[PDB]
Amino acid sequence: FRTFPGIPKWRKTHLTYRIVNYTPDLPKDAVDSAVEKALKVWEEVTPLTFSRLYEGEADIMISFAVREHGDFYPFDGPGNVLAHAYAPGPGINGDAHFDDDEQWTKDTTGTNLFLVAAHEIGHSLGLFHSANTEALMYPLYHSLTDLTRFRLSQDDINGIQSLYGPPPDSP
Ligand SMILES: N=C(N)NCc1ccccc1CCCCCCCCCC(=O)N[C@H](CCCCN)C(=O)NO
Ligand SMILES: [Ca+2]
Ligand SMILES: [Ca+2]
Ligand SMILES: [Ca+2]
Ligand SMILES: [Zn+2]
Ligand SMILES: [Zn+2]
Secondary structure (H helix, E strand, O other): OOEOOOOOOOOOOEEEEEEOOOOOOOOHHHHHHHHHHHHHHHHOOOOOEEEEOOOOOOOEEEEEEOOOOOOOOOOOOOOOOOEEEOOOOOOOOOOEEEEOOOOEEOOOOOEEHHHHHHHHHHHHOOEOOOOOOOOOOOOOOOOOOOHHHOOOOHHHHHHHHHHHOOOOOOO
């Protein structure tokens, strides 16, 4: 696995997130659910937990945008770049932006928000891209991915636990 230069990481266990805006592609509940599920994937392999804020500045600010949207990395329209996130830290760091020129769906008919979100939260937590072709952190989306068999690879777990450690206990 790979981390960010300087190995940035959250210095606290209880993190907060907030959905800044909503895409027209899906109903609000579908967006909230996808994000919650993406966060759950990581909470179960670390001693971290997440709480939602509806106002103010949360650690992880989530939003949808198109083309130029404020940062040094404008989106490219439909296809190619699907989203991007920033390493742990204050301000824009830890935030995740989704390209709304993509057709976000709850399933795989279009671009599954859950899968992409899970990958982005990986960056928000301090993980960069992996060369391991089975890792969630390997930068490649495929429409034929089977959601029912989704799970983190050992490379993703090793990586995230090298930063925050494993959960205090297990079933
Ligand atoms: N087959 C495997 N292992 N797939 C994982 C994987 C494993 C298990 C289940 C699903 C997936 C796919 C998750 C989707 C990951 C996103 C795919 C990358 C799309 C292109 C993109 O948006 N790239 C930017 C890079 C921007 C750089 C611009 N210079 C990025 O990465 N942002 O975060
Ligand atoms: Ca932030
Ligand atoms: Ca795009
Ligand atoms: Ca869209
Ligand atoms: Zn952005
Ligand atoms: Zn990525």
